[PDB]
């Protein structure tokens, strides 16, 4: 949790779902509701339809989104240029 004393912050009910699938395969579209979980270097090749308030945003990590967060890629608000 942004401190070099406990490692990163990854949800246990997320690990027990990702680590039981990454052993054999990259699972298909998955449902998640905790935008606050950090991306450990185990999500490579997988997808996560992260909630943003009204729906789920499917996000794929290729190589670089390891220090990011799941909700970082889900627009929580929508703005479309008043003019």
């Amino acid at each position: 949790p942004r401190s070099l004393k406990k490692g990163p912050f990854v949800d246990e009910h997320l690990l027990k779902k990702v680590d039981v699938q990454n052993e054999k395969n990259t699972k298909q579209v998955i449902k998640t509701w905790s935008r606050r979980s950090t991306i450990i270097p185990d999500f490579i090749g997988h997808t996560f339809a992260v909630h943003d308030g009204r729906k789920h945003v499917p996000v794929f990590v290729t190589e670089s989104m390891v220090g990011h967060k799941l909700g970082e890629f889900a627009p929580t608000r929508t703005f479309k240029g008043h003019i």
Binding site: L4, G7, P8, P41, E63, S64, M65, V66, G67
Partner: protein
């Protein structure tokens, strides 16, 4: 026509901090030229997010 038009072109000598020194004829400066980098010392003549997360955690 070379009477008064062309600038002076007289023998000179280049002294470099590296040590590469050669003598040619240069313009109005008749003295020496002090330089710090030459062809023998300049570069180009003598030549991950996951890793960052690993070293962070």
């Amino acid at each position: 026509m070379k009477s008064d038009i062309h600038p002076a072109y007289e023998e000179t000598t280049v002294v470099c901090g590296c040590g590469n020194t050669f003598q040619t004829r240069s313009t109005k400066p008749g003295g020496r030229i002090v330089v710090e980098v030459c062809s023998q010392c300049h570069p180009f003549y003598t030549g991950g997010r996951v890793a960052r997360f690993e070293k962070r955690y």
